[PDB]
Amino acid sequence: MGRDEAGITGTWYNQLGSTFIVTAGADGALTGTYESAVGNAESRYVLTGRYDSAPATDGSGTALGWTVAWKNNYRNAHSATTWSGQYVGGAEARINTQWLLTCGTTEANAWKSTAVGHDTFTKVK
Amino acid sequence: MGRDEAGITGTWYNQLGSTFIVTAGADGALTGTYESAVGNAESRYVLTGRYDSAPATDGSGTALGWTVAWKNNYRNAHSATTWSGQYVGGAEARINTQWLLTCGTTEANAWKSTAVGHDTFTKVK
Amino acid sequence: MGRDEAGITGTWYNQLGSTFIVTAGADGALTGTYESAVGNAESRYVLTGRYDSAPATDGSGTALGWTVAWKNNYRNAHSATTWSGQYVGGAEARINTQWLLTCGTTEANAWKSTAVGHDTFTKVK
Amino acid sequence: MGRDEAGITGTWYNQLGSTFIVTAGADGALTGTYESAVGNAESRYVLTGRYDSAPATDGSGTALGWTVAWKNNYRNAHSATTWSGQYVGGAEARINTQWLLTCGTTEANAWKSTAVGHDTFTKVK
Numbered sequence A, B, C, D: 001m002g003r004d005e006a007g008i009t010g011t012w013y014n015q016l017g018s019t020f021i022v023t024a025g026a027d028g029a030l031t032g033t034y035e036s037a038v039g040n041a042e043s044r045y046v047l048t049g050r051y052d053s054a055p056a057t058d059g060s061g062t063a064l065g066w067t068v069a070w071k072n073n074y075r076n077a078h079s080a081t082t083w084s085g086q087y088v089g090g091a092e093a094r095i096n097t098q099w100l101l102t103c104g105t106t107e108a109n110a111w112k113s114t115a116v117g118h119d120t121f122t123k124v125k
């Protein structure tokens, strides 16, 4: 089993009020659903990702990332977000991320295809 | 089946000489392996991601993303990369991406945890 | 004079304890000094940048950016950071930024030349 | 005078057809004008930035960055772009950059305030 498998598995919330539901597998897999409180999104979207299942023991965080394509049974926003970050355990566990949101564009609009931002996830709120 | 399921599935190469082997599923899943020609990496790493399986028909690209955690049977670089981008079909098919590489760090080093860059993948080279 | 010339001019502090001293000119110029609490840096570095001197009046923030090259009389870290963001006035004024730190590299190391992060500046601390 | 003062000073063009006119000062300053071939922009905009005026001599590039606020006498797009990158001299001199474009937004739209991309500048085209 992964070092932080139990620490990562569960329900997380970011500063926007979005809900990140994830299961960390012993093999390094991340699976679950994402519900965004903002943007062209409603209800849950499939997510998949990976995490370091044997992290350093020097107090460093645990690197991880995941992807949502913004298509479900309700809506298709023709776009995908990837979150890249690290899990930090302890009393106030956190997943600190930066993200890249790419829209499908024509080639003439490709220069403005990608948004960047940062989300912090906690176990509360 | 996804609109670009056949277009995306296969072997891709980026400008560094890295090899991206991916299968696009009818459900929007991306699965496969990544081999980086640079950095603290050797041989293949598991990847997983998502793509828009019903993209726009106005000539826009197909949004997608995937994650590699840099742990395999040979090495563990305690880090993860996410690629966010779009697939562009046609004679010279391309996957144009930007990426975020996060290292697990102490909190004192978290400000410098994340590298950003851009990779273009083609079916040749 | 710029709409937020007086709001922006002054001393700001980010979450790392770095000090951003800036003067906003009527013409859209930003001038001043930056002192980083972290990294290969000591004492003050020259900065220059630009801001929107006639922002929207619909409650939107004021877009701005600036650059530091990490060379002064004490040290040269062969690198430059740019901050891109917006000023938000009011009781708890803030400058919310994302930044790109590029190191001079050989071409073989150029893929890992750039760090990305986010700093929030306030008038206190 | 800066090591690459003469190498950097002049007219540059990126892959979009935008024109970057810059003067590198002996003190590390960058001054000039930017004309974007795309987006909410017409004619020239003021730019200012900084570069490493005493770079490494091991073949590494020269770190630099600059800012444009997208306001001039013709238009105001209430936004600013910062380019962060490095100058690479030689027969085919290049300035390789990544950039952050921030729009002034309401707080409700701040999550989508920032675009990210990459521009390569050459002395031809």
Ligand SMILES: O=C(CCCC[C@@H]1SC[C@@H]2NC(=O)N[C@@H]21)NCCCN(CCc1ccccn1)CCc1ccccn1
Pocket: A014, A016, A018, A035, A036, A037, A038, A039, A040, A041, A070, A077, A078, A079, A081, A099, A101, A103, A105, A109, A112, A113, A114, A115, A116, A117, A119, D111, D112, D113, D114, D115, D116
């Ligand atoms: O809302 C969505 C899906 C929901 C996204 C929610 C985000 S994930 C990161 C963050 N954390 C979170 O919990 N929730 C948010 N997806 C399309 C987003 C529309 N774009 C316009 C289309 C377009 C056309 C042409 C060029 C570019 N886009 C947004 C505008 C924009 C700004 C900057 C860069 C790219 N796009």
Ligand SMILES: O=C(CCCC[C@@H]1SC[C@@H]2NC(=O)N[C@@H]21)NCCCN(CCc1ccccn1)CCc1ccccn1
Pocket: B014, B016, B018, B035, B036, B037, B038, B039, B040, B041, B070, B077, B078, B079, B081, B099, B101, B103, B105, B109, B112, B113, B114, B115, B116, B117, B119, C111, C112, C113, C114, C115, C116
């Ligand atoms: O090599 C690796 C794994 C291989 C990465 C290969 C990359 S994926 C994007 C690109 N496309 C590709 O095909 N191949 C490359 N992983 C650790 C990378 C070491 N870092 C030092 C550790 C550290 C300690 C403290 C703070 C930050 N890192 C790299 C240095 C760095 C620079 C900037 C930002 C973050 N880290």
Ligand SMILES: O=C(CCCC[C@@H]1SC[C@@H]2NC(=O)N[C@@H]21)NCCCN(CCc1ccccn1)CCc1ccccn1
Pocket: B111, B112, B113, B114, B115, B116, C014, C016, C018, C035, C036, C037, C038, C039, C040, C041, C070, C077, C078, C079, C081, C099, C101, C103, C105, C109, C112, C113, C114, C115, C116, C117, C119
């Ligand atoms: O410390 C510095 C100067 C001080 C930077 C302070 C930063 S500004 C953003 C932030 N807000 C703030 O208030 N303070 C910090 N400058 C070089 C930074 C060394 N790098 C290693 C050299 C190298 C060699 C080869 C490839 C890449 N770098 C850092 C490691 C790194 C990680 C990821 C991407 C790039 N570089």
Ligand SMILES: O=C(CCCC[C@@H]1SC[C@@H]2NC(=O)N[C@@H]21)NCCCN(CCc1ccccn1)CCc1ccccn1
Pocket: A111, A112, A113, A114, A115, A116, D014, D016, D018, D035, D036, D037, D038, D039, D040, D041, D070, D077, D078, D079, D081, D099, D101, D103, D105, D109, D112, D113, D114, D115, D116, D117, D119
């Ligand atoms: O065109 C401009 C000014 C010209 C920009 C030209 C760019 S510089 C980088 C690149 N290299 C170059 O040579 N030329 C381009 N400036 C506003 C740009 C409108 N935005 C909509 C407003 C808005 C409202 C709410 C939230 C976000 N924006 C663009 C859409 C967008 C997508 C993603 C992230 C942010 N904004």
Ligand SMILES: [Cu+2]
Pocket: none
């Ligand atoms: Cu949009």
Ligand SMILES: [Cu+2]
Pocket: A055, A056, B076, B078
């Ligand atoms: Cu280890």
Ligand SMILES: [Cu+2]
Pocket: A079, A102, A103, A113
């Ligand atoms: Cu978009």
Ligand SMILES: [Cu+2]
Pocket: none
């Ligand atoms: Cu490293």
Ligand SMILES: [Cu+2]
Pocket: A076, A078, B055, B056
């Ligand atoms: Cu559609």
Ligand SMILES: [Cu+2]
Pocket: B079, B102, B103, B113
């Ligand atoms: Cu690293």
Ligand SMILES: [Cu+2]
Pocket: none
């Ligand atoms: Cu370093």
Ligand SMILES: [Cu+2]
Pocket: C055, C056, D076, D078
């Ligand atoms: Cu206006």
Ligand SMILES: [Cu+2]
Pocket: C079, C102, C103, C113
């Ligand atoms: Cu560096």
Ligand SMILES: [Cu+2]
Pocket: none
């Ligand atoms: Cu726009």
Ligand SMILES: [Cu+2]
Pocket: C076, C078, D055, D056
């Ligand atoms: Cu030196």
Ligand SMILES: [Cu+2]
Pocket: D079, D102, D103, D113
């Ligand atoms: Cu915008």
